Subunit: 249 residues, 4 copies
C-alpha cells in the first residue's frame, strides 16, 4: 500500500516542501496568500498564484489498474473590500508533475480557454466567485467540479461569508469513484456540499502534484484575497481511516 501524507497547521516564510508559483507568498504571520495582497491588506487585480506540495503523489497504478483514495481538508479566507464586485476564485487541484500556471482570471490558473482538452490532466474543486457565462457558470457563487474543463461537470450554490473563515473537506473514494467537497463557516453555521462520480484513472497520470491555485480580476475593483491558513492531505493506493483523519490528520 502506497501512502502519502502531510499536515500544515500553519505555513512558514521558509517552506521548502511547498513550491510557490506565480504570486503566491507565505506571510510572516504564516498565511499562504495565494494571490497579491498589498500592505494594508487590500487584495490587488490581475493576480495569479499556485502552491503545490514538494512531492509527487501516486494517484493510480496501471500494472494493477488500482486508483488511490484521498482526503484533504484546509481552512481559507476570502476578503472583498467591496462585495458587490468580486473575482475570480480559488481551487484545490490535481495535475501532472510539473504543471505550470495556465491563464488567470476565470481560468483560475488550471486551464487555457473555455474548451475541454484531455491534455490538461487536471481535476480540481473550484470555489468560484465571478460568473463567466462563457464557461456556463451558474449565476450564484458556487462550488464546482472541474475535469479538464473549467466548465464544471457539476456545481452547487455557495454563499461567500465575506472575510470569514471556511473549513473544507474534499474526499475521494476509490471504490465508489465518488468525489465530495464539503464547505462550512463555523461563524455563520452555514454549510454546502457536492458529489459526483469522476474517474481519476482516465483523466490523471499515475503521478500528480496537488495544491491550490487562485486568480483575481482582470479589471480593477473586481478584487479579493485568497488566503489559506492550514492544509491537511492523505492518499492511499491499495494492492482510508477517515474518522481518524478529520479528527487527527
Amino acid at each position: 500500500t502506497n501512502t502519502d501524507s502531510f499536515t500544515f497547521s500553519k505555513f512558514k516564510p521558509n517552506q521548502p516542501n511547498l513550491k510557490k508559483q506565480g504570486d503566491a507568498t507565505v506571510t510572516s504571520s504564516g498565511t499562504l496568500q495565494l494571490t497579491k495582497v498589498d500592505k494594508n491588506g487590500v487584495p490587488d487585480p490581475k493576480s495569479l498564484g499556485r502552491a503545490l506540495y514538494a512531492s509527487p503523489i501516486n494517484i493510480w497504478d496501471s500494472k494493477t489498474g488500482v486508483v488511490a483514495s484521498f482526503a484533504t481538508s484546509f481552512r481559507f479566507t476570502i476578503y472583498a473590500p467591496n462585495i458587490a464586485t468580486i473575482a475570480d476564485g480559488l481551487a484545490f487541484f490535481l495535475a501532472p508533475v510539473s504543471s505550470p500556471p495556465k491563464a488567470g482570471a476565470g481560468f483560475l490558473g488550471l486551464f487555457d480557454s473555455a474548451v475541454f482538452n484531455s491534455s490538461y490532466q487536471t481535476v480540481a474543486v473550484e470555489f468560484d466567485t465571478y460568473e463567466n457565462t462563457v464557461f456556463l457558470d451558474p449565476p450564484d457563487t458556487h462550488i464546482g467540479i472541474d475535469v479538464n474543463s473549467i466548465k464544471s461537470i457539476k456545481t452547487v450554490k455557495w454563499d461567500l461569508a465575506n472575510g470569514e473563515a471556511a473549513k473544507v473537506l474534499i474526499t475521494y473514494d476509490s471504490s465508489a469513484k465518488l468525489l465530495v467537497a464539503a464547505l462550512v463557516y463555523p461563524s455563520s453555521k452555514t454549510s454546502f456540499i457536492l458529489s459526483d462520480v469522476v474517474d481519476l484513472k482516465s483523466v490523471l497520470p499515475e503521478w500528480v502534484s496537488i495544491g491550490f491555485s487562485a486568480a483575481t480580476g482582470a479589471s480593477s475593483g473586481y478584487i479579493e484575497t485568497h488566503d489559506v491558513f492550514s492544509w491537511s492531505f492523505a492518499s492511499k493506493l491499495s494492492f482510508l481511516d477517515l474518522a481518524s483523519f478529520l479528527v487527527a490528520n
Copy 2:
C-alpha cells in the same frame, strides 16, 4: 490525551462490544437491523431498536474543563415497500451510560414527550422520515440536530433515496463547538449537510455511551427498514 476508537466494517452475530437494545439484531449477513424486518425483507410496524458501543466514552472533563472532539461515519440503508407511507427514522446519539430506550415512533427511542428536558442529557442527529406536527417537524423528510428534545434546534431538507445506501459523516470540533452532519448517496450522487454550535459540556455527562436508535410507525403501513452496514468512531479529549 484520552482517546477512544473503533471500526466495524461489518457486524457479527456474536459481538460483545455492541449492546443491542429493543428489537435490534445482527443478521447472519452481518447487517445491523435496528428495526424488525420479517423473513421476506418486509419492515414491521411498531418496532424500536438501539445499538451502542460496549464502552463509555469520556466526553468532557470537569476538572480541566476541556471538551472532546469526535468523528463518526457509517453507511446505512432505509427500505420502504411503499414510499408514500413511511416512519419514523433513525438517529446517531450520545447519552448517559445506562441510557435505556424511551418512547418509540416519533420519539426515536431517545425522548418521552415533546417538551425540552435537561435531564435527558442526550444529543442526537436524526434522520427523520415522518412529519410530527406536534414536534414542529418540517413538511419534508429531514436531517435534524436534537438537544434534549425531539424538537430539533436545527434542520435541513433530506430527500430519501429509497433502498439505496447512505454514507454519513458526523463531526464535532470542540474549539469551534461545531456539530456537522453530512449525508451522501453514491448511487444517486445527491448530498446533504447541516451545521450548528452545540455546547456539549452543558448537556452531556462527562461519560456517555454512543450509538444508534431507530423506530417504525405506530399506524401499520408506516414502515421501513433501518439497517446499519458499517460504523467507525473516534474521539480525542486533551489535557
Copy 3:
C-alpha cells in the same frame, strides 16, 4: 476490517472503561497502582491487582481464519525500598472476556500452578522480578513470553532500574506470527528486546479483554510497586500502521 483502540495518557479516579480487579486502584494524581501502596509510598506484601479495558477485542475469526495484528505501549514504574529483596512482577496480558484474577505471587494473577493448560487461553508478556525455580525462572530479573504457562516459552535479561519510568512497546504481526516486546529507560538509556513466534488462534478465544496484572511478594519485605502511568492499544483484524501509532503514543 474490524479494529479497536484507545489511549490513556493519564488515569482518572472515575474510569468506567477500565475494570479494576483485586487491589488495582487509580490515585488522585492519576497513577494506576496495580498492587497496594500506603500513603507514604510503601509497597505492601500479599497484593494482587489487574486492570483491563471495559470492551472486548476481536483478535481472530473462525468463519475467516484471519488473525488480528496488534500493538500496545505503556509507561510503568517499579519502586523498591530495598533493592535486594523484590517480588513478584507485572504483566501485560490477553485473556478471555471475562477472565478473573488467578493465584497471586509468582503466578502474577494469571495462573494457578506451574503446568501448561490449554484452557488458560492466556498470552502474557511478563516483567518478572523474582526467581521461582519451580517455574524455570532464570537467575536474573527478566522479560518473558507466557503462553498458557507461567513457564515462559522464551526470556531475556532485564535489568530493573529502581523507581525509573520504563517505556514498553509490544507488537504482534499476524502475517509473520511474530510477537515482540521492547523496554527502554530514557533516564538510564538502557534497552531490552525479545521476540518469538506464537500462534494466537490456537491459544486465545476469538474475543479477549486486555490489560495488566501484578503481584507483590508472599514473603514480607519482598516488596515493590507496580505503577502504570499511561497506556495505549490498537488492534486490526482483516476481512498496524505501526509507525504512525508509536508517534501518536
Copy 4:
C-alpha cells in the same frame, strides 16, 4: 502541528517521490537496490548508493525551539556469497536537503574521514558489516548511532542473518531526546536494540531529507547486497 508521512510497501521502477543517487536502482520486482548487483544477483565491489524521500522534513523549529518526534520502519535484506568477506553496511540517515553522497566503503556515503565535523549535520543509525578499526569499530558486526561522525557515539552487537529480511523500527522522542533502533529477523527470531539521548537541534538543520545510504567493499570480494523492500516514515513537529 507540522506533520509529514509516507508509506512505500513496494518500490516502483518509476518512483518520483524518491531521489536516487549513485548506484541506487529500483528493480522490476520493486526492490530498492542501494548497491550494485548483476543479472545473477551477485553484489559488486566499489559501489555506493543512496535513496531519499523527494520532499524535505522540518525536524525542528527555531522560532518556537521545539523538536520533531518521528518514527520510521523498514524491511531490508543483505546477502553475501561469502559471509567471511563482507563490507561495509547500510544506514538510515537525516542530513541537510541537497546533501550529496560522500566517500564510499565504511564511510557509508555519509562522511569523508574518521573525524567529527560539526558541519556534516548528519545523524545516522548504521548497520555496519565490516570492522573498520580506524573508526573505533567493535570486533563484531553492529548497530550504531552516528552523530556527525562515522565513529559511533554508541553501538551494540548485531548478528547478520545472511540473505534473510530484517525489520527495523527507529524511533525519536523530542521530549526525552531518546533515539531507539530495534532490529528483528522474523525467520530467525533474533532481536537487537540500541538507545541513546541525541540532541537533534544542535546537530541538524531545521530542514532535512531522510533516507538510506549503502556501500560494498573497496577490496576484491568484500561484498554483499543492501536491498530495501519497504519503508514508512512519520514525523510530528509541535506548533
